[PDB]
Amino acid sequence: TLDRVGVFAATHAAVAASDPLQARALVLQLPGLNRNKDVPGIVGLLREFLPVRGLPSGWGFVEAAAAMRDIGFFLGSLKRHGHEPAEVVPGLEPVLLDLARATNLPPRETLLHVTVWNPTAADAQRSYTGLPDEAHLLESVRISMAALEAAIALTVELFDVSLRSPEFAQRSDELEAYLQKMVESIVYAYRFISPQVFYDELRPFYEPIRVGGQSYLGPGAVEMPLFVLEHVLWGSQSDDQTYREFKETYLPYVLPAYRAVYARFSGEPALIDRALDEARAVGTRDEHVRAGLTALERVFKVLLRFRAPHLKLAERAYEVAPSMLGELLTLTYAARSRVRAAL
Numbered sequence: 638t639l640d641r642v643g644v645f646a647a648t649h650a651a652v653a654a655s656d657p658l659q660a661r662a663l664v665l666q667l668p669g670l671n672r673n674k675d676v677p678g679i680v681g682l683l684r685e686f687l688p689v690r691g692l693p694s695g696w697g698f699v700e701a702a703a704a705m706r707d708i709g710f711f712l713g714s715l716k717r718h719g720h721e722p723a724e725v726v727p728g729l730e731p732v733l734l735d736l737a738r739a740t741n742l743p744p745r746e747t748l749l750h751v752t753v754w755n756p757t758a759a760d761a762q763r764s765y766t767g768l769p770d771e772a773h774l775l776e777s778v779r780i781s782m783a784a785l786e787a788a789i790a791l792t793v794e795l796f797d798v799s800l801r802s803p804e805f806a807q808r809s810d811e812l813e814a815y816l817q818k819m820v821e822s823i824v825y826a827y828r829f830i831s832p833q834v835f836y837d838e839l840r841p842f843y844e845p846i847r848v849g850g851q852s853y854l855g856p857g858a859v860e861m862p863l864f865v866l867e868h869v870l871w872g873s874q875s876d877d878q879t880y881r882e883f884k885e886t887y888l889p890y891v892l893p894a895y896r897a898v899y900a901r902f903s904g905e906p907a908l909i910d911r912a913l914d915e916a917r918a919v920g921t922r923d924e925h926v927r928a929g930l931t932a933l934e935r936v937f938k939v940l941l942r943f944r945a946p947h948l949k950l951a952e953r954a955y956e957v958a959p960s961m962l963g964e965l966l967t968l969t970y971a972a973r974s975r976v977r978a979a980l
């Protein structure tokens with residue numbers, strides 16, 4: 638059914654299988670040290686595998702991303718205990734900058750590093766805390782990431798598909814099916830992740846750190862390139878300043894290819910702007926136009942089935958939220974409503 642997922646999951650598995658600093662047995666020791674708030678021990682453990690002689694010259698993207706993952710868990714940990722990692726680990730910042738250069742990603746761990754690039758076995762999976770809730774959080778992202786990447790590709794493909802073609806309805810239907818995985822992620826998070834443990838125990842590990850004279854955010858699910866998908870789908874031409882700033886904030890943390898997708902579509906009319914213009918010119922008497930628009934409305938429905946329950950999850954956590962979530966929700970409803978009004 639979701640036949641496009643495989644190639645994305647295989648690209649993640651390559652990084653997850655890589656251990657170029659031979660760090661697996663070492664990183665497993667980190668949760669114990671975190672529980673004990675043993676800052677000197679955390680540094681000492683990192684120095685057991687941190688390269689001091691620059692990066693091995695035969696490394697490609699896979700090795701450098703895997704290295705960033707394994708050092709990365711130490712970065713959020715050190716900052717969790719109140720320390721700038723670059724300040725307490727001499728020689729660390731150059732290695733972080735070298736790995737940023739090798740991966741074209743920021744100089745710390747991102748969501749990708751800690752979820753899909755992180756091996757799944759109990760004797761391999763890297764973790765800040767070792768807690769069941771952190772493991773369930775990783776699983777919730779693994780449920781939908783590959784499917785989301787397939788969805789980005791489908792959205793880009795749909796963008797060049799005429800609403801007059803029966804291919805428009807078919808592509809949209811297929812798109813909707815991939816985006817249902819985001820819904821499955823939030824349902825999973827609801828079932829398995831305690832907001833008490835999240836806010837008190839996990840959230841402290843996601844503070845920003847300073848590298849290269851700026852601040853880089855911690856590896857949250859917010860970094861999922863869903864904002865790129867919707868930039869193409871409906872948001873590229875938005876003049877809403879809060880929204881624009883949101884997208885620009887997280888842009889540095891997504892894969893290079895999705896930063897390029899983002900740039901390609903910026904300014905330019907979004908998919909639904911073009912679709913609705915096409916519908917207004919040709920008319921909804923055209924069977925394919927009607928079917929296309931109907932299928933497109935279902936795409937917005939599934940986005941809303943992710944977004945509204947995600948907002949309640951976040952509020953339940955903050956109870957024991959950032960206004961941006963409410964505003965994005967509002968924008969999504971208005972986009973869907975534009976699609977409905979065309980019908």
Ligand code: HEM
Nearest residue numbers: 777778822826835857858859861863944950951954959965
């Ligand atoms: C208890 C768990 C969670 C909490 C408390 C939470 C909270 C938040 C918060 C506060 C934001 C706004 C940015 C920020 O301040 O970090 C955000 C954004 C976002 N989060 Fe979560 N989140 C949780 C789980 C998840 C999961 C499981 C996913 C998907 C697998 C997810 C996906 C997203 C996305 C895509 C955004 C961007 C906003 C949007 O697209 O609507 N989050 N979340």
Ligand SMILES: [C-]#N
Nearest residue numbers: 857858859860
């Ligand atoms: C959601 N980070």
